[PDB]
Design a protein around this ligand. Structure first.
Ligand SMILES: Cc1ccc2c(Nc3cccc(Cl)c3F)nccc2c1NC(=O)c1csc2c(N)ncnc12
Ligand SMILES: Cc1ccc2c(Nc3cccc(Cl)c3F)nccc2c1NC(=O)c1csc2c(N)ncnc12
Ligand SMILES: [Cl-]
Ligand SMILES: [Cl-]
Ligand SMILES: [Cl-]
Ligand SMILES: [Cl-]
Ligand SMILES: [Cl-]
Ligand SMILES: [Cl-]
Ligand SMILES: [Cl-]
Ligand SMILES: [Cl-]
Ligand SMILES: [Cl-]
Ligand SMILES: [Cl-]
Ligand SMILES: [Cl-]
Lengths: 272, 272
């Protein structure tokens, strides 16, 4: 039982907000983050999606997954997690332009693969892996989460989500950008998104920087005539890492490796 | 369900061992610690004590409690946790004699109180809090655990445990050293042990260093004529902290504060 009784959490500064909820810093036996719906009486849909998220988080005990701590239903449906100081990998690579040594870049890839390997072993498909969803706790430890879910983006309704493409387009596998289905999401589309994260780590920049419109990326990635340019990778990038990236980014999902083998390859590369 | 199927954990280097089990470094979606019984067919007593420990750990989701990750029953009863690099607080204070600034000493006390406040809110009595059981993950983050349980020391049988006094005597409340009962252990004896940890932080040394025999400490602490000498505390120790220590170390257990108030006092002192 992880329900936190009403009145125990002290809700603090507002941290993030969108059409589907708000996240605050709070206090409950130390620092916590608290994500709640902006509404008063949830629709059955809103309640059930809340339960889906809690049921995913309740399955996770791993140092590279953000730690779920509890939930509450009075007065608002809220999810409580550990509070992490630091910032997303996206901020580090593309805003502060932190200068990570190659060793630390590989360490970040390795911790990300540990968390993703764990999630897939728990039959959890992430659906929105990207560098903004990889938090560097004290700029050292990877915490995978979905930092847009139920604030800026809605919770999942099948394979639909409001603001689905928002800040996510560059990480979407070809079969996800097309959605010739009712579920394109799989372990293999998580693997593709991880390949794009590897691209960010090894180039320091976002793919398709030269393309001038989103719909262009939509069309050409869904068509198979657009792919990350692996020649823009830094010179100190290990040969193994370029091979691995190319494997994760393959157009047909069944050709991509799985995270057990991804992780073992990165572990080998880290050993050097 | 947290049972890890057989064959998934790769058991590595032996880390610790005693009459009641062994702990190894291992691999399972990253680094783990794995504690198993040294035996083949456990007695009902051994099995049940294993279940007691798993049932305590399964109740904990807190950044200052060592993260339980799973257990297994084939081929040996094993408990799996995160792997922490670093060393115990005891090692830092009394072996490497690390020079912690007062701010970091207070931070360690504050994280310890967060974890203990959480445990007591979950109705978990620790029973063996001491600086060797406070792990400094990357020498920065407190992880409370019981690092002697089911290796050097046995699991709990009521209020009995083999090697109960081993390395623990200095942290035992008067009513625990006497055991005029079948259970002297309470939230309040945890609070006393925390006071002794505060003493180690503020003096840098172990209480009763001058006394030459264990049985002397037994007798005089059980009698009430022996107490930590708070005048040996460092000069930069805040007045609030000496007051708090004296409160936690009171002889009659009902006079000691509880961890919600302990934590709020340390949080205030940290703010300065
Ligand atoms: C409260 C809360 C609940 C669920 C989360 C969540 N749920 C989730 C959903 C699907 C898959 C996975 Cl793996 C998930 F973890 N993901 C990420 C963050 C989640 C979260 N916290 C924040 O939103 C947050 C913003 S800033 C910040 C900070 N500085 N420290 C700690 N938290 C935060
Ligand atoms: C495997 C395992 C299982 C249960 C533990 C346990 N159980 C427990 C019992 C009662 C109360 C509480 Cl709070 C508890 F956490 N406590 C502490 C450690 C526990 C543990 N790990 C070690 O023994 C360990 C030695 S070295 C090291 C390291 N470097 N990194 C991580 N682990 C270790
Ligand atoms: Cl607090
Ligand atoms: Cl759980
Ligand atoms: Cl590093
Ligand atoms: Cl929603
Ligand atoms: Cl969801
Ligand atoms: Cl919909
Ligand atoms: Cl690994
Ligand atoms: Cl500090
Ligand atoms: Cl035992
Ligand atoms: Cl036990
Ligand atoms: Cl016995």
């Amino acid at each position: 039982d992880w329900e936190i009784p009403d009145g125990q959490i002290t809700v603090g500064q507002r941290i993030g907000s969108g059409s589907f909820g708000t996240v605050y810093k709070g206090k409950w036996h130390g620092d916590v983050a608290v994500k709640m719906l902006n509404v008063t009486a949830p629709t059955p849909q809103q309640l059930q999606a809340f339960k889906n998220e809690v049921g995913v988080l309740r399955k996770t005990r791993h140092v590279n997954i953000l730690l779920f701590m509890g939930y509450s239903t009075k007065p608002q449906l809220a999810i409580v997690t550990q509070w992490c100081e630091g910032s997303s990998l996206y901020k580090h690579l593309h805003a502060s332009e932190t200068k990570f040594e190659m060793k630390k870049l590989i360490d970040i890839a390795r911790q990300t693969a540990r968390g993703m390997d764990y999630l897939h072993a728990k039959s959890i498909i992430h659906r929105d892996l990207k560098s903004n969803n990889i938090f560097l706790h004290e700029d050292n430890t990877v915490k995978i989460g979905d930092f847009g879910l139920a604030t800026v983006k809605s919770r999942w309704s099948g394979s639909h989500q409001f603001e689905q493409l928002s800040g996510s387009i560059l990480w979407m596998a070809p079969e996800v950008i097309r959605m010739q289905d009712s579920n394109p999401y799989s372990f293999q589309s998580d693997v593709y998104a991880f390949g794009i994260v590897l691209y960010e780590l090894m180039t320091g920049q976002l793919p398709y920087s030269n393309i001038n419109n989103r719909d262009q990326i939509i069309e050409m990635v869904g068509r198979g005539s657009l792919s990350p340019d692996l020649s823009k990778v830094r010179s100190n990038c290990p040969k193994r890492m370029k091979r691995l990236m190319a494997e994760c980014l393959k157009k047909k999902r069944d050709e991509r490796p799985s995270f057990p083998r991804i992780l073992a390859e990165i572990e080998e590369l880290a050993r050097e």
